[PDB]
Amino acid sequence: MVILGVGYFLLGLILLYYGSDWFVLGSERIARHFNVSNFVIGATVMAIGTSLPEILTSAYASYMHAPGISIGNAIGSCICNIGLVLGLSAIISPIIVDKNLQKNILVYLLFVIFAAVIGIDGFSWIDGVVLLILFIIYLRWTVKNGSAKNNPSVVFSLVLLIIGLIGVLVGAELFVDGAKKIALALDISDKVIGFTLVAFGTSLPELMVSLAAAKRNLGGMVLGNVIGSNIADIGGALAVGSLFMHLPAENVQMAVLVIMSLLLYLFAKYSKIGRWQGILFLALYIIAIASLRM
């Protein structure tokens, strides 16, 4: 069952490549239809849609008595979204953040700090409930501040979005599924092959989507996708995971995330998110994946 593993692998890449573009284009059209900014549509629809793997992963893992994976996958994705995903995107298409999206990012920072503080002694199911409620509040707050027949322009837009989303979710799965089949067929299969492959596999939707939007100079959409995903990973994935079982404290990873989130805000507020800010993000992500524990 090799080659068919290469089959799922390459095909998943193709579905990720074109699927992300369709998702970006469809989301961009939807945003203009509902008269909202690209940030808003990225922080809500796109973010939640791409964070669906994390939510299902964290829920399933915690239910299977593996709470370490649940919180590990959740936080690792957050670090990945700022370090790798935003890092690459910022370099491709530098972002100048308007004074109104700066407020949203500051709110994001507060949310992260709050999660880190209450997570010091781990995350209880009550911690999850609270985070999930704030998650819900953030969404409505974001949409309001960015708001205000079978129309063929609207239908085609929704088809682009949905099919594109299916493309990146199925594609990301085929990528991981093809990679597990190859490693097994080549007898090079550990168990953090493995945990590394799936945790990064859940981040593949955000990566390809944000890179697609970055290529089209949609920096607001990219920034929304990153900020929204992180909140969806904490208020959604991590929260749901804590409902099934107490999640052990990841104080080091949370600290890294808080620092990265702090850096993201300061750059957006007093400077820009461009090449050298993107380079710094990639540097920290590389240092993170080099010295953080598996």
Ligand SMILES: CCCCCCCCCCCCCCC
């Ligand atoms: C919409 C559902 C939100 C989450 C509700 C979670 C309830 C979790 C209960 C976990 C066990 C609590 C045992 C207490 C002794």
Ligand SMILES: [Ca+2]
């Ligand atoms: Ca706690």
Ligand code: NA
């Ligand atoms: Na994801």
Ligand code: NA
């Ligand atoms: Na996401």
